[PDB]
């Protein structure tokens, strides 16, 4: 319960550049 892993960022905006 104390070991929260690095969760996924599921809302990735579009990158420009």
């Amino acid at each position: 319960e104390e070991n929260v892993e690095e969760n996924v960022e599921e809302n990735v905006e579009e990158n420009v550049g």
Epitope: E1, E2, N3, V4, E5, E6, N7, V8, E9, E10
Partner: antibody, heavy 116, light 109 residues
């Protein structure tokens, strides 16, 4: 009983170095994530860094990237926070906590003062 | 990054009253990896609620939490003299697992 004891740290000048140690006992060390948290004078709590159980993944707050390094030795039950190139705004009380989510078990906290 | 902003800045109530502390995020909440902490000056911080609505071990029943949409609320049903302190919310789903700026719960007179 879960025991967390922060050591190291003290008075240092800008650009100096300090190595914090969080000697743990009372639980399987290599089975838990570990976390460093600090709080400066007249400011709020700030999450600094955490490390996976096997030390293969480390994450940092932006203000300490490239300067602070979190590490661990699971055979010695010790969590480390190598602080290089310290700044005046790094002056705070540094706590080590168990886990990576809701931090239940905290240490007493060691004081780091950076000033010229 | 998601930034947590707590409301109000200072909460002034009397013992026995009902306390409601807010914690709003830059965008809509998408998980329950949220916590509430209590901090008294000179004393070690203390977890009150994890998982957005689960009381930590030993926390009295008068502490309860809930999350909905863009607001994360801590509720103290009746204020005990030992409850006036500083309260921080926190997200811990992923990096950075940052806190709120803090809410000062003072005594009203």
């Amino acid at each position: 009983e879960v025991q967390l004891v922060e050591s190291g740290g003290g008075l240092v000048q800008p650009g100096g170095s300090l190595r914090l140690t969080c000697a743990t006992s009372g639980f399987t060390f290599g089975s838990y994530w570990m976390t460093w948290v600090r709080q400066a004078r007249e400011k709020g709590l700030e999450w600094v860094a955490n490390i996976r159980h096997d030390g293969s993944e480390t994450y940092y707050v932006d203000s300490v990237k490239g300067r602070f390094t979190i590490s661990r030795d699971n055979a010695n039950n010790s969590l480390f926070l190598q602080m290089n190139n310290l700044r005046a705004e790094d002056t705070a009380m540094y706590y080590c906590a168990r886990g990576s989510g809701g931090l239940v078990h905290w240490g007493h906290g060691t004081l780091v003062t950076v000033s010229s | 990054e998601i930034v947590l902003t707590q409301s109000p800045g200072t909460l002034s109530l009397s013992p026995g009253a009902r306390a409601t502390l807010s914690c709003r995020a830059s965008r809509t909440f998408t998980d329950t990896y949220l916590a509430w902490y209590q901090h008294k000056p000179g004393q070690t911080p203390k977890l009150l609620i994890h998982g957005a609505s689960s009381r930590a071990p030993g926390i009295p029943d008068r502490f309860s939490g809930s999350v909905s949409g863009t607001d994360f609320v801590l509720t103290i049903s009746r204020l005990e003299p030992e409850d006036f302190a500083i309260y921080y919310c926190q997200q811990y789903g992923r990096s950075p697992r940052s806190f709120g700026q803090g809410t000062r719960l003072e005594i009203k007179r």
